[PDB]
Amino acid sequence: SRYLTDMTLEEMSRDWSMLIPKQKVAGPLCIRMDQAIMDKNIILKANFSVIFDRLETLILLRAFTEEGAIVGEISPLPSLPGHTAEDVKNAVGVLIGGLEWNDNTVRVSETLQRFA
Amino acid sequence: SRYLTDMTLEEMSRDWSMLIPKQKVAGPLCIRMDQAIMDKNIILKANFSVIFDRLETLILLRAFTEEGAIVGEISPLPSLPGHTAEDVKNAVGVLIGGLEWNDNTVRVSETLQRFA
């Protein structure tokens, strides 16, 4: 019983577009990032469901340019196979990877690093 | 002039082609990899110049499918700025990253891991 956020409802409800789309499936999680993006300073805001006072399941992470532009996202698979912080942190390191590839400078919301 | 190798002259002298080309510049080093490649088992063979009995400079690393197919390569920049094992290991972790992205299963020549 709960849920936690870095992002605004807006930030999440919003829909977005990749010029150079890149999907992937990391076990129970779908990573996406626009490869067209370069030399920008990015951040990963994310929002986990919180159960009995602990970061449980990640609901949604997305990547933001300084300009509030969405450039990447990790969203649970529709079949919602139960996923672990591993599947996550893994998936994360990855998206970062893919992003860093374009000289992009990627930070992470305090929320996240916490985990674990 | 002394020097060490995993690859055959053939393997190195050879020229190759990327369906989905991906370049990058990692300080003094140019990484390349064909993003088109997927679900294959890859290995990184590399060849360092050896000075007074230590792995000094990397001359060339390339990535190989099981089928002896070249799919990625790290080659020093033409201007040959003196590079360090860092610039390297960095660059390496990267290429691996980029490769792993396509479900590719990437190994590394014993030579390499050695370093450092």
Numbering used by the authors:
A (entry chain E), B (entry chain B): 87 to 202
Cite, word for word, the article reporting this structure.
In contrast, several possible ED homodimer interfaces have been proposed based upon crystal structures obtained using NS1 proteins from various strains. Although the helix-helix dimer interface is shared by all structures of the NS1 ED, and may have some biological role in that RNA-binding activity of NS1 is affected by its disruption, we noted that in all helix-helix structures the arrangement of the two ED monomers differs markedly relative to one another. However, at this same concentration we routinely observe complete dimerization of the PR8 and Alb/76 NS1 EDs. A key aspect of our functional model is the instability and flexibility of the NS1 ED helix-helix dimer, which seems weak and transient in vitro, but may be slightly more stable in the context of the full-length protein, or become more permanent in the presence of certain binding partners. ED dimer flexibility is likely permitted by the presence of several glycine residues at the homodimer interface (a putative GxxxG protein-protein interaction motif) that allow the two helices to rotate easily relative to one another.
The N-terminal 73 amino-acid residues of NS1 form a symmetrical homodimeric RNA-binding domain (RBD), which is connected to the central effector domain (ED; residues 86-204) via an inter-domain linker. Present models of the tertiary and quaternary structures of NS1 indicate that the protein possesses two globular domains, each capable of forming independent homodimeric interactions.
